A = this chain, B = another copy of it.
Amino acid sequence: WESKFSKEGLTFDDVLLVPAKSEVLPRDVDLSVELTKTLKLNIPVISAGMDTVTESAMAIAMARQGGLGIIHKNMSIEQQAEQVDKVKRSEFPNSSKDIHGRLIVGAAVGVTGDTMTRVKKLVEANVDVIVIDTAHGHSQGVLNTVTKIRETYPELNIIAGNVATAEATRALIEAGADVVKVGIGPGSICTTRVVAGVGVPQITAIYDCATEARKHGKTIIADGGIKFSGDITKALAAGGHAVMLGSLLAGTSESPGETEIYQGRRFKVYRGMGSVAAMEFVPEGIEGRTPYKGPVEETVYQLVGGLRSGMGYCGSKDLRALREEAQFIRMTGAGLRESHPHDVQITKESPNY
């Protein structure tokens, strides 16, 4: 009862990274990360397991750039296994590949009667990682599913989430998860925080969960709330090993969403998997759209470029240095307004702003 209000949470717009001594240019920093010893990325960027972000074209484009795509689960078992199989069979100097030289891929599952059959067919399609993808990962049903998957497939890479506390992170890892996916409500189209009243500001969520994961030698995926390339530097410096992106990739050519025309501008639909449209209720997502942006490679190049620039300012030669050594400073809303362009009429913006 007395402790009810002591905790304080920060998100991306509350903080800046403090520059430090640099000896490594942005172009020479190392962006590789091992989520597990058999799940290695050359850039710390994952496309979300959402029906408006990732099917095989997005998963192929992401692995060719050294990242990872998660095939969404809003499709039949047989359809999802075929999508994984198309990525595995695809035929890019930064490409992330398995021991057989095939592009890496992941696939989402839920906690339903079907889960173990879905996992079996995805493993037979040589998926590199399963994502146990739920609204509330800190739940007995989720812990039971992690355990049953880990028992059936002792070497299978498992990402489980979503969570936002040290205690939940601990519980998923004790059940057998390799990677904990962090974020409760920060998503661009998510309304969890408003309709349920629940969540943790994302920089605090990442930091608290990464602090726990490090005790177990496991890794974090920072899922949600990222709006700019600098938010990637921030998410990783807070402890994340890799980021997961939805809205920043939903407008790209390889995303599966419907196109919409409005005021002569092309958009693609972007919607929550908690929206009335995706689950088909008391919804925890809404439906929106984001401008058409062209090939995902051009968006990734700008996002990775901002990350490399941030690492050069922090003097981080690699992502371990960024996670372990980078320092934040807290800012007010006046700090935030100074950090964006201000007091000038803007005519032309940039790919990255």
CA distance A207 to B285 in the complex (A): 30
A10 to B337 CA separation, bound complex (whole angstroms) = 12
User: CB distance A230 to B194 under 8 Å?
Assistant: yes
Residue of B nearest to A270 (CB): B344
Known contacts A10-B332, A194-B340, A309-B195; A22 and B138 CB within 8 A of each other: yes
Q: Does A234 have its Cβ within 8 Å of any Cβ on chain B?
A: yes
Q: Does A321 contact B (CB under 8 A)?
A: no
A289:B342 contact, CB within 8 angstroms: no
Q: Does A110 reach chain B (CB closer than 8 Å)?
A: no
Closest CB in chain B relative to A11 CB, distance in Å: 5
Interface centre among A171, A237, A289, A352 (most CB of B within 10 A): A352
A178 to B90, CA, bound (A): 59
Q: CB of A302 within 8 A of chain B?
A: yes
Chain B residues lying within 8 Å of A14, measured Cβ to Cβ, are 332, 334-335
Interface residue count for A (Cβ, 8 Å)? 121
Q: How far is the CA of A335 from the CA of B231 in the complex (A)?
A: 14
Contacts of A329 in B (CB 8 A): 7-9, 200-201, 204
Most buried by B among A18, A23, A163, A225: A18
Contact pattern, A 340-351, Cβ under 8 Å of B = 1, otherwise 0? 111111111111
Determine the chain B residues whose CB is within 8 A of the CB of A194 once the complex forms: 228-230, 339-340, 353
Q: Report if A330-B9 is in contact (Cβ < 8 Å); known contacts: A171-B21, A198-B310.
A: yes
Which residue on B lies nearest to A269, using beta carbons? B347
Tell me if A8 and B276 are in contact (CB < 8 A). Answer: no
Chain B residue numbers with a CB within 8 Å of A101 are none
A347/B200 contact (C-beta < 8 A), A11-B334, A353-B195 known: no
In the complex, whether A290 has a CB less than 8 A from a CB of chain B is yes
- Tell me the bound Cα distance from A85 to B3 in angstroms: 46
Q: Does A180 contact B (CB under 8 A)?
A: no
Residue from B5, B191, B233, B262 in contact with A328 in the complex, judged by beta carbons closer than 8 Å: B5
Minimum-distance CB pairs A-B, first 9: A197-B230, A282-B305, A193-B339, A197-B233, A13-B334, A288-B344, A196-B310, A198-B313, A196-B309
